Structures are given as structure tokens and as C-alpha cells.
RNA sequence: CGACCAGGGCUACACACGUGCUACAAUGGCGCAUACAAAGAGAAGCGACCUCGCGAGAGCAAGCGGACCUCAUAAAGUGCGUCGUAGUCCGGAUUGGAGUCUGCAACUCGACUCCAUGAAGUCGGAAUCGCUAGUAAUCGUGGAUCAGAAUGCCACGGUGA
RNA sequence: UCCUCCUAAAGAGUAACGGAGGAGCACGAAGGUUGGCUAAUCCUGGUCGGACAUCAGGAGGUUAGUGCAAUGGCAUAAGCC
């Protein structure tokens, strides 16, 4: 799981990349084997939004979170991703 | 490995050499014509080839003759 | 015996007329030639030394003596008296025929042979060089051999200084720069 | 089976078998046999020594192993001593001719250490 | 010399390409047929080509001719 | 923060990802001989033939605003010969030397030719994609953009599951 | 309990919960004889080979070596084949 940060109008600082990476690593360890993750940070004049695309064995899964300060948006996106992962995980356990 | 017949120089480098050789070994020659070759009557001169933001001087040595002036003045700086 | 005889009646005149010697036994004659092949890979393979002991038995004309380790250093994982090299000391006529074979057919078959080094003297007049290939000798047939190793040759003379060794080998037309 | 310093293959045809000399390939190797009167599909065991000695001085014309290696070392060391752009790339191990360096560049680079 | 330990050692005739038939004593097979020897090996004349090689003005003067 | 010019940069490179081309060979490589397309472009343009050059190409120079002339030899195929399973006569990267053409001008940074050099690669883990028939897979050809610069794009046929 | 040195006061001996170290074996050759030979450590030259493995030469003269601690001894060798 490698992770790929990009930003539209959001200058990705090194402290910003450290935190996002840590949060993603923690989520990956907790729910499922994940192969690759793309993170997109957008700012549209008010809305600090974040997109993420996880490539996992079952397939792609995506989430999006708008926030106030970028950090909040990232947190929302990560929680959403975790919820999606729980669904995918036992969706392909289903014994 | 180009230009089958005759080397290339500008008139503002050829006439500027033939002016400043018979007029003694002098001040370094600011040159913008990087694309021009190095003739053997240019040996012994300090010419300052423009690299984009400098005019870096290089002493013309005997081995530099078949090359061009921009070959001895790098543009991009790495580390 | 050929260039032994050439030593007997050309080199004595050359060295006495260059060095104006009082006695004839002031001339530098060569005492021996020792061919070393220090293996080192014997601690990795014990019977690999037998392949080295067969090479000097074919390069030189006699059975070489395996040389043990004198000191027990741990820097190369050896102990007292483990066989790690092989020398062979040839004297008498075997060094003149070996010398003729060397400077006649075996030095020129060193590939990419520039002029040979002349700095190699002990300050007493004993030459020492080292050859990288066994393939330079016609005895090594290159087709039955297994790895390319080397050896080193030591020409021990009765010279008093290095310059007499230079003039002696230069009298034999030994190659230099 | 000893020309130019080495030449030791056998059971190969001649024009392919000469190409183990550092300095000859399949064009100059045909130039040697066409210039020395030897058919191209014979074997080195099938040559007689009265042909092989006529091939040794034949390949002594074109530059071979040692002279070519110290010659190319003279060329690269000459460029690195001038310190031009090309020799400046030779001092650092990056593509000289102007290849892409953002992505591939990997023969001149080597393996990938990180 | 000791017996029954040392290899064979026979006086054979080694001949080279340029014609130096010379019989020396070694431990080789039937006989030897060399190519290069102390004669016809360029360690006496063919050694000074690496020095008279370089220069760039002399290369440059095949292109001006005026 | 408009306008003009020169030089540079857009081509930088510890690295990461995507899309492709060439391979890892014997259903093949190389050498000789030889069969069969459709579609298209062309006037400061396409450029026969003939000489010179190993060759990229050069000189002269017809013809053609074109079912006529030119680009323009299709290639895989086929017959013969060799290579005998190896980093090999595979692969063609990188680098050195020498050139050609275009354009005021090929240094940063073009394409191609010749000689030499001969890297990784011996069919690719986890994961992943396209494709139901003239399709997939391979083989070549043309066009636009363009002075020059396709391994991309857009087209066309061959063999053909 | 035993061995070695110092304390131990120039014969021997000599104490302390004084100062420092070792043994509870090994070897049929590591014993006997005969024959022979001489180290350590530096410098120079020498293919991989380095600061050092092997070779040659020089300085040096036991600064080594002894199956195992330390003392005494050892070249006529008690040291190594």
C-alpha cells in the first residue's frame, strides 16, 4: 500500500503529508490488505475537500469529504473509507 | 556531428575576435552566441559565454577547438 | 643453456666494459628464479590447491612445494601451518631454460603487452614481477583449465644494487620501457 | 586459435568466430575474410596455420583489443578533463546524448538503490 | 634431482609464424607451433602509436581549407 | 501583469505512478532468391531514370495539380543454406569515432547512416486489462501536424484463431 | 587442597578476610635417539592481495617460541622439521 498525494490549489506541506500518511497507514493496518491509495486535495474558495481512491483486491472504492480546514476533511474521508472497507471486507468473507 | 561544410560563427563573434586579437589580449569578451564553434585563432582568450543568467568566463584551450561555445557553459544547476 | 652460454661470453664483456670491473667475479650473475603462486582460496576449497600445484608443475618443470601459513591471523581465517600457497625454486639449468622460455615465448604471449615495468627492483638488484594469466604459457592449453589465476616471478641475482640488475637484464634484452 | 591476442573459439564458423575480438563485428569480420581470401562458413579447426598467420596480420590493420580500450579511455578521460557538457555527464553517470532523465535513464544509472 | 615425482621434460622444437625455429625444453605435447615470440612481437617498434595520436586543431584544419 | 529582442528553460532527476515500443528466442536469428494488397498524399510540392557514395544521401533531371507521374521495394509468407539451446549468430540499451539532411542556427536539445561497443532480460510475485469473428493475436502501408522531428494519434489492407 | 610471583628484611623459612594470576589435565607422540635447521617485528619489490595470508631481499638478533598460569632457564638449544 503506497500511498500518492496530490493537490489542486492546496500546497501540500511536509507536515501535511506526514499526518495524512500516518492516518492512512493506521486505517490500512486496521481493516484490509490494501494495494494502493490515491489522495486528492481540492480547495474551491470555501470548501476544503478531499478525495481518496483505494485499490483493493475486490476493486476500487472511493470516498469524498468536505471540511473547514483540510485536516477535518481528511479525517472525515478516512472514517468514510474505514466504513467502506468494513463493508467490502466481510462482503467478501460472507461465510 | 552536423553542418557538412564550414564551421559556424556569427559576424559579431568573428569580427569581434579579429578585432580583439590584433588589439592585444584584453578584457573577457561577453558573448551571447553559444551556438558558434571555436576557431584556433581564439586560443588564449577569456570569453564569457552567456548561460542564461551569467556570463561565465572560460579560458580557451587548444583541445576545445572542434566544439562550440555553449558546450563549455552549463545552464541548469543541479544540487 | 643457450642464454647461459650467451651469459658466458657476451654479458661478461658488456658488464666489464660498462662497469670497468677489476675481477671477473664482480659481475652480477643471476642465482635463482622462484615462482610463487599464493592461493588464498585454499581455506574455501582444500583441493583447489592441487589445481594450483599442477599449474606450477607445468609452468616450471618440477613439482612445487606447498607453502604453509606462518602466522595465524584471523583477518583471513587461517591458522598456523595451513597450506595457503605454493612456491617452486628453480636454479642451475632449469632457470636458464625457463628464462629462455619466459623472455622468448612466454612474456610476448602476455596479451596487450606494453613495455614492461622497470621500477620493480628491491634496491639490491633482484627483479620481481607478476603475471595475471596462466594462458601466456603454451603448457596451459586453456581448454582443460577451470579458473584464471596468476602467479609471480622473482629473479634473484647476485647484483650489488638495482642498476646492475638493470644492465644485466638489459644485456639479456629483457623487455622494459 | 590465437589472433590479435586471444581468438579462442572453435566449432564456430569463421566470420562469427572472429567477433570475440574487441574491435570487430560482423561487417569488419567479413572484411577480414574477404580481404584475406577465406570463405565465410569454415571453422577455426578447419583453417590451416598457413591461413591463420595470414589472418593475424590481416586483423593487425584494424585497431583491436588493447589499443582500442586505452584509446576509448583516452577519449572519455579527455572529455572529462576538458569538463564540457558531455564529459560533465561522464563524470556523473547520466545519459550523454540527451536522453530522458525524468523517468528511465537506467542503463547509464544502474540498478535502483532506493 | 629426485625421480618419479617430477613431470616429463623434453626438448621440443617451438616454431613461430615469422620463422624462428627454436628448440627449447619444456613439458608440452608432440611439438609446438607458435605465432609470436621474442621476434615479430611489437615490443621493439610497434609501441609508439599511442603517443602520436591526439590533437584537435590538426583535425579542425581538414574543414577550413581557406 | 502591456510591447520588442538575445540567451536559457519547457528536455532538469535520490524517487513514485500511468500508457506504449522492443525483447527474453528455434512457431526463431541471419544470408540469397521470390509471390500477393487496400487506402492515401503531392506545386516555394511529390520527385523517376542515369552517375557518385558501404550507407543515410549528393549531382543532373524527366514526369505529375494527378485511375497516367512520383512517394513506392509491402511485410509476415514461400524455397534453399546455416545456426543446435548458449546470455548464444538472442536481445540493441548505453558509449566512442566518422558522416548525411533540414534549417540563420542540431551545445544545452533533432532525425538518420556507417564502424565499433554489447547492458538488463532466460516469459515476469501480490494485483490487473482487452477481446465473441474477419474479432483477438501478429505483419507491413499511408495520412494529418510539419523546414526537420512518431514507439503516439487517425486510417488501410495481409495472415488469421 | 595444590602451582607461580611479590610482600620476604641479598642462605632457607616466614603472617594477615595482604597484592596478582592458575590446576584437578594432556600426549603412544607432544616420549627415546639420530640427522638437520633458527626466530619476533619493521622496510623494499611483487597478480588478485589489503595495514597485515604467500615469494624474494635487507635491517635486526630472540624484543620469539615452549600443549596450558607465572617465575627460573634454553642456541651445545629445553625452540621447529
Swiss-Prot record, chain B:
PROSITE patterns: RIBOSOMAL_S19 (PS00323)
GO annotation, cellular component aspect: cytoplasm; cytosol; cytosolic small ribosomal subunit
UniProt entry keywords in alphabetical sequence: Ribonucleoprotein, Ribosomal protein, RNA-binding, rRNA-binding, tRNA-binding
Keyword Transcription regulation: no
Keyword Thylakoid belongs to the record: no
Gene Ontology molecular function terms on file: rRNA binding; structural constituent of ribosome; tRNA binding
Domain of life assignment: Bacteria
Record-level GO BP terms: cytoplasmic translation; ribosomal small subunit assembly
A Pfam cross-reference name: Ribosomal_S19
InterPro entries the record matches: Ribosomal_uS19 (IPR002222), Ribosomal_uS19_bac-type (IPR005732), Ribosomal_uS19_CS (IPR020934), Ribosomal_uS19_SF (IPR023575)
Family: Belongs to the universal ribosomal protein uS19 family.
UniProt xrefs under HAMAP family: Ribosomal_uS19
NCBIfam families: rpsS_bact
Function, in words: In the E.coli 70S ribosome in the initiation state it has been modeled to contact the 23S rRNA of the 50S subunit forming part of bridge B1a; this bridge is broken in the model with bound EF-G. The 23S rRNA contact site in bridge B1a is modeled to differ in different ribosomal states, contacting alternately S13 or S19. In the 3.5 angstroms resolved ribosome structures the contacts between L5, S13 and S19 bridge B1b are different, confirming the dynamic nature of this interaction. Bridge B1a is not visible in the crystallized ribosomes due to 23S rRNA disorder.
Subunit structure: Part of the 30S ribosomal subunit. Binds S13 and L5 and cross-links to the A site tRNA.
Name of the protein in its database record: Small ribosomal subunit protein uS19
Organism (species): Escherichia coli (strain K12)
Swiss-Prot record, chain C:
Annotated Gene Ontology cellular component terms: cytoplasm; cytosol; cytosolic large ribosomal subunit
GO molecular function, one term: tRNA binding
UniProt cross-references to SUPFAM superfamilies, sorted A to Z: RL5-like (SSF55282)
Residues modified to N6-acetyllysine: 2
Keyword Oxidoreductase: no
InterPro entries: Ribosomal_uL5, Ribosomal_uL5_bac-type, Ribosomal_uL5_C, Ribosomal_uL5_CS, Ribosomal_uL5_dom_sf, Ribosomal_uL5_N
Keyword set, alphabetical order: Acetylation, Ribonucleoprotein, Ribosomal protein, RNA-binding, rRNA-binding, tRNA-binding
Transmembrane segments: none
GO BP annotation list: cytoplasmic translation; ribosomal large subunit assembly; translation
Gene3D superfamilies linked to this entry: 3.30.1440.10
Family as reported in the entry's similarity comment: Belongs to the universal ribosomal protein uL5 family.
HAMAP family: Ribosomal_uL5_B
Entries under NCBIfam families matching the protein: PRK00010.1
Quaternary data: Part of the 50S ribosomal subunit; part of the 5S rRNA/L5/L18/L25 subcomplex. Contacts the 5S rRNA; cross-links to the P site tRNA. Forms a bridge to the 30S subunit in the 70S ribosome, contacting protein S13 and S19.
Further facts: Identified as a multicopy suppressor of the slow growth phenotype of an rsgA (yjeQ) deletion mutant.
Name listed for the protein in its UniProt record: Large ribosomal subunit protein uL5
Organism encoding this protein: Escherichia coli (strain K12)
From Swiss-Prot, chain D:
GO biological process: cytoplasmic translation
InterPro entries: Rbsml_uS13_C, Ribosomal_uS13, Ribosomal_uS13-like_H2TH, Ribosomal_uS13_bac-type, Ribosomal_uS13_CS
Region of interest: Disordered: 93-114
Highest rank taxon of the organism: Bacteria
Keywords: Ribonucleoprotein, Ribosomal protein, RNA-binding, rRNA-binding, tRNA-binding
Entry's Gene Ontology cellular component terms: cytoplasm; cytosol; cytosolic small ribosomal subunit; small ribosomal subunit
GO molecular function, a single term: rRNA binding
UniProt xrefs under PROSITE patterns: RIBOSOMAL_S13_1, RIBOSOMAL_S13_2
Effect of residue 104 to H: In PW095; partially suppresses a rimM deletion
Cross-referenced Pfam families: Ribosomal_S13
Family classification: Belongs to the universal ribosomal protein uS13 family.
Biological role: Located at the top of the head of the 30S subunit, it contacts several helices of the 16S rRNA.
Annotated HAMAP family: Ribosomal_uS13
Subunit structure: Part of the 30S ribosomal subunit. Forms a loose heterodimer with protein S19. Cross-links to the P site tRNA and weakly to the A site tRNA. Forms two bridges to the 50S subunit in the 70S ribosome, contacting the 16S rRNA and proteins S19 and L5.
Name under which the protein is recorded: Small ribosomal subunit protein uS13
Organism annotation: Escherichia coli (strain K12)
Swiss-Prot record, chain E:
UniProt binding sites for Zn(2+): 16
Modified how: Proteolytically cleaved by protease VII to yield a peptide lacking residues 63-70. It is not clear if this is due to protein degradation or is a bona fide processing event in the strain used in PubMed:339950 and PubMed:10556732. In strains B, D10, MRE-600 and Q13 the only protein seen in PubMed:10556732 was full-length; the last 7 amino acids were sequenced only for strain MRE-600.
N6-acetyllysine modification, residue list: 8
PROSITE patterns linked: RIBOSOMAL_L31 (PS01143)
Cofactor note as given: Binds 1 zinc ion per subunit. Only 1 ligand appears to be Cys, the other are thought to be His and either backbone amides or solvent.
Keyword field contains Protein transport: no
Sorted UniProt keywords: Acetylation, Metal-binding, Ribonucleoprotein, Ribosomal protein, RNA-binding, rRNA-binding, Zinc
Signal peptide, first to last residue: none
GO biological process terms on file: cytoplasmic translation; negative regulation of cytoplasmic translational initiation; translation; translational initiation
GO cellular component: cytoplasm; cytosol; cytosolic large ribosomal subunit
Function of the molecule: Binds the 23S rRNA.
Family: Belongs to the bacterial ribosomal protein bL31 family. Type A subfamily.
Subunit structure: Part of the 50S ribosomal subunit.
Protein name as annotated: Large ribosomal subunit protein bL31
Gene expressing this chain: rpmE
Amino acid at each position: 500500500m503506497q500511498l500518492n498525494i496530490t493537490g489542486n490549489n492546496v500546497e501540500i506541506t511536509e507536515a501535511l503529508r506526514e499526518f495524512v500518511t500516518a492516518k492512512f497507514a493506521k486505517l490500512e493496518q486496521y481493516f484490509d490488505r490494501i494495494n494502493q491509495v490515491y489522495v486528492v486535495l481540492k480547495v474551491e474558495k470555501v470548501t476544503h475537500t478531499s478525495d481518496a481512491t483505494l485499490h483493493v483486491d475486490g476493486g476500487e472504492l472511493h470516498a469524498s469529504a468536505e471540511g473547514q480546514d483540510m485536516y477535518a476533511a481528511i479525517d472525515g474521508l478516512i472514517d468514510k473509507l474505514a466504513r467502506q472497507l468494513t463493508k467490502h471486507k466481510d462482503k467478501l468473507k460472507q461465510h | 556531428r552536423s553542418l557538412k561544410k564550414g564551421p559556424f560563427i556569427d559576424l559579431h563573434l568573428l569580427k569581434k575576435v579579429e578585432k580583439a586579437v590584433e588589439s592585444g589580449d584584453k578584457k573577457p569578451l561577453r558573448t551571447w552566441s553559444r551556438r558558434s564553434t571555436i576557431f584556433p585563432n581564439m586560443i588564449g582568450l577569456t570569453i564569457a559565454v552567456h548561460n542564461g543568467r551569467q556570463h561565465v568566463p572560460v579560458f580557451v584551450t587548444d583541445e576545445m577547438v572542434g566544439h562550440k561555445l555553449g558546450e563549455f557553459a552549463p545552464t541548469r544547476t543541479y544540487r | 643453456a643457450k642464454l647461459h652460454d650467451y651469459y658466458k661470453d657476451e654479458v661478461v664483456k658488456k658488464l666489464m666494459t660498462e662497469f670497468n670491473y677489476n675481477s671477473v667475479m664482480q659481475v652480477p650473475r643471476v642465482e635463482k628464479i622462484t615462482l610463487n603462486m599464493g592461493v588464498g582460496e585454499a581455506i574455501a576449497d582444500k583441493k583447489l590447491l592441487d589445481n594450483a600445484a599442477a599449474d606450477l608443475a607445468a609452468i616450471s618443470g618440477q613439482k612445487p612445494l606447498i607453502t604453509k601459513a606462518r602466522k595465524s591471523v584471523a583477518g583471513f581465517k587461517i591458522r598456523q601451518g595451513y597450506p595457503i600457497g605454493c612456491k617452486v625454486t628453480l636454479r642451475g639449468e632449469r632457470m636458464w631454460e625457463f628464462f629462455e622460455r619466459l623472455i622468448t615465448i612466454a612474456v610476448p604471449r602476455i596479451r596487450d603487452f606494453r613495455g614492461l615495468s622497470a621500477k620493480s627492483f628491491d634496491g639490491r638488484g633482484n627483479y620481481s614481477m607478476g603475471v595475471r594469466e596462466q594462458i601466456i604459457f603454451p603448457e596451459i592449453d586453456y581448454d582443460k583449465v577451470d579458473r584464471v589465476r596468476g602467479l609471480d616471478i622473482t629473479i634473484t641475482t647476485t647484483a650489488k644494487s638495482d642498476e646492475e640488475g638493470r644492465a644485466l637484464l638489459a644485456a639479456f634484452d629483457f623487455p622494459f620501457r | 586459435a590465437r589472433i590479435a591476442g586471444i581468438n579462442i573459439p572453435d566449432h564456430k564458423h569463421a566470420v562469427i568466430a572472429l567477433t570475440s575480438i574487441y574491435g570487430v563485428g560482423k561487417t569488419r569480420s567479413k572484411a577480414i575474410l574477404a580481404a584475406a581470401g577465406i570463405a565465410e562458413d569454415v571453422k577455426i579447426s578447419e583453417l590451416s596455420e598457413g591461413q591463420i598467420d595470414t589472418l593475424r596480420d590481416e586483423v593487425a590493420k584494424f585497431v583491436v583489443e588493447g589499443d582500442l580500450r586505452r584509446e576509448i579511455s583516452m577519449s572519455i578521460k579527455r572529455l572529462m578533463d576538458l569538463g564540457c557538457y558531455r564529459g560533465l555527464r561522464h563524470r556523473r553517470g547520466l545519459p550523454v546524448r540527451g536522453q530522458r532523465t525524468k523517468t528511465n535513464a537506467r542503463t547509464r544509472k544502474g540498478p535502483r538503490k532506493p | 634431482m629426485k625421480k618419479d615425482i617430477h613431470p616429463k621434460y623434453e626438448e621440443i622444437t617451438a616454431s613461430c609464424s615469422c620463422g624462428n625455429v627454436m628448440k627449447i625444453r619444456s613439458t608440452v605435447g608432440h611439438d609446438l607451433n607458435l605465432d609470436v615470440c621474442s621476434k615479430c612481437h611489437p615490443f621493439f617498434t610497434g609501441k609508439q602509436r599511442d603517443v602520436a595520436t591526439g590533437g584537435r586543431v590538426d583535425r579542425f584544419n581538414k574543414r577550413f581549407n581557406i
